[PDB]
Amino acid sequence: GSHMKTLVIASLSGGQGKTTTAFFLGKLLSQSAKVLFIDAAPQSNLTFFLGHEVEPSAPTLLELIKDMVEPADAVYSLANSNQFLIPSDDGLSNAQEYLASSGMGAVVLKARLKPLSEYFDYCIIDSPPARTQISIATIGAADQLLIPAEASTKGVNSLIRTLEIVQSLEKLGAFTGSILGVIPFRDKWFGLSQSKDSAGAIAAMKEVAPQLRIFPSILESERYKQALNQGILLSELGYPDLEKPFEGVKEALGIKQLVQ
Amino acid sequence: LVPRHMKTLVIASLSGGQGKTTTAFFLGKLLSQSAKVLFIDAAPQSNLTFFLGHEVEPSAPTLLELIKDMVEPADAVYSLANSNQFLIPSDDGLSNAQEYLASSGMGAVVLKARLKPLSEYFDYCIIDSPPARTQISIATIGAADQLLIPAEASTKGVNSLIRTLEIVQSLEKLGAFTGSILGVIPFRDKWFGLSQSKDSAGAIAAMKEVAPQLRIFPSILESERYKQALNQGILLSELGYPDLEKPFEGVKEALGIKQLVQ
Numbered sequence: 001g002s003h004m005k006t007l008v009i010a011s012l013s014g015g016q017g018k019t020t021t022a023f024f025l026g027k028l029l030s031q032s033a034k035v036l037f038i039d040a041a042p043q044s045n046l047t048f049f050l051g052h053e054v055e056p057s058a059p060t061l062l063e064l065i066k067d068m069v070e071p072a073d074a075v076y077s078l079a080n081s082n083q084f085l086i087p088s089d090d091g092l093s094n095a096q097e098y099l100a101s102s103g104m105g106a107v108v109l110k111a112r113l114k115p116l117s118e119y120f121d122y123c124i125i126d127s128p129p130a131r132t133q134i135s136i137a138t139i140g141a142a143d144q145l146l147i148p149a150e151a152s153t154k155g156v157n158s159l160i161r162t163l164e165i166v167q168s169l170e171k172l173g174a175f176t177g178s179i180l181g182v183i184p185f186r187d188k189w190f191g192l193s194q195s196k197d198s199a200g201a202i203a204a205m206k207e208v209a210p211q212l213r214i215f216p217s218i219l220e221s222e223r224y225k226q227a228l229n230q231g232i233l234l235s236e237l238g239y240p241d242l243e244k245p246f247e248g249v250k251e252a253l254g255i256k257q258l259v260q
Numbered sequence: 261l262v263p264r265h266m267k268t269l270v271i272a273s274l275s276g277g278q279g280k281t282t283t284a285f286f287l288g289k290l291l292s293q294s295a296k297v298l299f300i301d302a303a304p305q306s307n308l309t310f311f312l313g314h315e316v317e318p319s320a321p322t323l324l325e326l327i328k329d330m331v332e333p334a335d336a337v338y339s340l341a342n343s344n345q346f347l348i349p350s351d352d353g354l355s356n357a358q359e360y361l362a363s364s365g366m367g368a369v370v371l372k373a374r375l376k377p378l379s380e381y382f383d384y385c386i387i388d389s390p391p392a393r394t395q396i397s398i399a400t401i402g403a404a405d406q407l408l409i410p411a412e413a414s415t416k417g418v419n420s421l422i423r424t425l426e427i428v429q430s431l432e433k434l435g436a437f438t439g440s441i442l443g444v445i446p447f448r449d450k451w452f453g454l455s456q457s458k459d460s461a462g463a464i465a466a467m468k469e470v471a472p473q474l475r476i477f478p479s480i481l482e483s484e485r486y487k488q489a490l491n492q493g494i495l496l497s498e499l500g501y502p503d504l505e506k507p508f509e510g511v512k513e514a515l516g517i518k519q520l521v522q
């Protein structure tokens with residue numbers, strides 16, 4: 001009955017908030033929808049944060065990409081009944097050349113996930129940094145692309161370079177989705193006033209890509225890691241305001257909040 | 261640029277946002293107070309080049325052309341504002357080197373080879389690596405006389421240390437890495453006065469468990485001052501926070517004790 005929408009979190013620079021976004025957005029979406037998390041990063045941060053351990057001979061994203069197992073076999077249930085995961089471990093960097101060797105790497109993951117379409121409402125994919133076969137393949141898989149970008153000059157560059165890869169993949173017919181928007185990351189506020197550098201970076205993001213939605217920022221705050229470490233939502237920790245970047249995305253997806 | 265025994269220090273950490281560029285910046289500037297320093301920005305995202313105040317002009321040779329042997333190494337070296345600091349810059353096109361290095365069959369030793377002609381020009385070469393296991397991050401490790409691994413004081417950082425060491429071991433076995441590991445710099449270690457955050461403490465203890473043989477330098481503390489000093493293009497000591505510079509003073513003292521003796 002489902003028509004799975006694949007949301008890919010991409011940003012080529014390191015530490016731009018990709019995994020933090022995948023974790024919170026995915027948990028939030030799972031409140032009323034069936035969500036398939038995919039950890040596409042060889043460093044395997046999301047797999048760990050979602051509380052999943054990979055047993056020695058257990059099929060991961062690697063085995064799926066290499067078509068060594070059926071898609072449903074690399075899918076594991078999580079604590080929550082609306083949450084599932086295709087995990088990764090450090091061996092995933094081996095997919096790097098499998099993808100290169102195919103000559104169609106950018107559409108391999110896209111192809112591998114199609115059979116899971118009617119089992120889930122959303123697929124959320126956490127991408128690694130750097131331009132590689134894996135980060136290109138996650139982008140190729142996207143129905144909707146989300147780019148977290150640090151609210152700094154580094155983040156603006158990440159936005160720009162990420163958009164360049166999408167534009168190139170679109171030309172070659174691998175990217176057929178749309179760009180949902182940009183989430184500024186580590187936007188620094190001093191009480192009620194925004195830091196000039198953060199404000200300036202976001203303003204620069206809008207100049208770079210005038211057509212893109214800029215979502216509410218992931219504010220510079222230790223509360224995100226606090227909630228993450230406890231396995232809970234920012235709202236559940238008592239900081240609903242910090243959750244608004246993700247609520248904004250959810251609203252953009254046309255998802256209507258539950259009401260009382 | 262005139263010749264006058266260069267030691268190549270490579271900053272490597274496979275995970276994103278581990279303090280590589282921050283370390284390269286502050287360490288290089290600190291060392292340049294008493295040595296001639298060549299920065300190399302080996303990251304396609306080109307953060308270090310920007311932070312050092314360099315703009316790459318339309319047709320200017322950069323690290324890409326050096327890696328591809330299209331220019332003499334000295335032709336890709338640019339002077340910076342400080343007369344003891346120099347830079348081989350990068351720009352977005354540097355990703356093209358991934359191809360070239362792969363096709364050589366010996367990428368891990370290519371950068372190492374390209375830099376030898378500069379041996380008698382500089383005292384230190386400081387190379388900022390990109391994240392992720394790629395031909396470029398492998399080639400920077402191969403070029404190292406001394407390797408420094410900044411690693412976030414978190415489970416993520418511990419994993420970066422673990423995986424970075426795996427790449428180093430592989431390259432050591434194959435004869436590409438012939439240097440030594442100078443040590444680990446914990447990054448974004450959270451302290452409030454004398455109270456260290458439980459997660460930071462736990463991660464740093466795990467790093468020592470992973471690599472008991474390695475020197476752990478003083479931490480780069482979680483602090484907005486680091487961002488401020490970077491944005492202004494100055495040292496932390498110059499900003500008026502010399503104590504935040506302890507990690508790099510620690511490295512400098514470790515390199516100084518390695519000074520040849522009779």
Ligand SMILES: Nc1ncnc2c1ncn2[C@@H]1O[C@H](COP(=O)(O)OP(=O)(O)OP(=O)(O)O)[C@@H](O)[C@H]1O
Nearest residue numbers: 013014276277278279280281282391481482483486
């Ligand atoms: N002491 C500090 N406290 C908090 N944030 C810091 C500190 N030092 C640097 N940062 C910021 O943390 C982020 C990561 O640092 P940096 O860019 O040096 O990591 P990196 O390993 O070079 O990242 P990449 O993998 O993208 O190359 C940057 O936004 C940087 O400005």
Ligand SMILES: Nc1ncnc2c1ncn2[C@@H]1O[C@H](COP(=O)(O)OP(=O)(O)OP(=O)(O)O)[C@@H](O)[C@H]1O
Nearest residue numbers: 014015016017018019020129219220221224275276
């Ligand atoms: N709101 C916040 N303020 C400050 N730091 C944060 C915030 N949210 C997350 N962080 C921290 O910033 C760092 C980078 O975040 P994260 O790992 O999500 O980025 P990433 O893009 O997934 O990195 P990588 O490129 O390594 O995959 C992590 O230490 C994370 O815990």
Ligand SMILES: [Mg+2]
Nearest residue numbers: 018019041045
């Ligand atoms: Mg990540």
Ligand SMILES: [Mg+2]
Nearest residue numbers: 280281303307
């Ligand atoms: Mg960097």
